[PDB]
Amino acid sequence: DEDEIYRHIRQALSSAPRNQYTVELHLQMIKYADKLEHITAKAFCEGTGLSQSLGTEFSKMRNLTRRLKAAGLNTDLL
Amino acid sequence: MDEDEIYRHIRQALSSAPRNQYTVELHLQMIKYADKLEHITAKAFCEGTGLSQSLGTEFSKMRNLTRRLKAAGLNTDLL
């Protein structure tokens, strides 16, 4: 499961234009955070091809996602 | 809503949040009001909300997520 998720994230990021990359990165983190609750930020960056420096950003987005879902976000639609 | 009243809503939510929820609340408030603040710079956002200019980059990131988040069902009235 996690490896399929990482492939989907990589396909989305590799396809994003430069000026949409940061947005797409954050949206992919939010999209899958609820299926990756058990993973470390380090493992997330390794799986997706991201610099390990982005780990804190994943940790932030994973916390944010719980509150966005409570406000109606359906992460399947991202 | 005038921009300053939006800033006051953000300041009030930040003041009301527990310390251990501050950073999440800040990002949620940025998302909540980004689309009513489309005309402001991140510098003006930080000045209006009493935040360090170093947080401007956080507003720049969050404000550009709203279109896709709302299309996926996010109701900012619930934030």
Author numbering:
A (entry chain B): 2 to 79
B (entry chain A): 1 to 79
From the paper:
Here, we describe RptR (RMS-proximal transcriptional regulator), a small transcriptional regulator of a defence island in enteropathogenic Escherichia coli composed of a toxin–antitoxin system, DarTG2, embedded within a Type I restriction–modification system (RMS). We determined the molecular structure of a RptR homodimer and, using transcriptional reporter and in vitro DNA binding assays, show that RptR represses the promoter of the defence island by binding to a series of three direct repeats in the promoter. Both RptR and its binding site are highly conserved across diverse bacterial genomes with a strong genetic association with Type I RMS, highlighting the role of RptR as a novel regulatory component of an important mechanism for anti-phage defence in bacteria.
Consistent with analytical SEC, RptR formed a homodimer of two helical monomers each comprising four alpha helices (α1–α4). Each monomer presents an extended α4 helix splayed out from the dimerization interface at the C-terminus; the intervening surface consisting of the two α4 helices forms two basic (positive electrostatic) regions that likely present the DNA binding site of RptR. In contrast to RptR, the dimerization interfaces of HTH regulators are typically distal to the DNA-binding domain. In RptR, dimerization is mediated through hydrophobic interactions between residues in helix α4 and the unstructured C-terminus of the protein (i.e. residues L74, L69, R68, E25, and L65). Dimerization is also further stabilized by residue contacts that are more distal from the C-terminus including a key electrostatic interaction between Glu25 and Arg68 and a hydrophobic interaction between Val24 and Leu65. As the crystal structure of RptR bound to DNA could not be obtained and given the very high similarity between the crystal structure and the predicted model of RptR in its apo state (RMSD = 0.50 Å), we used AlphaFold 3 to model homodimeric RptR bound to the 9-bp DR sequence.
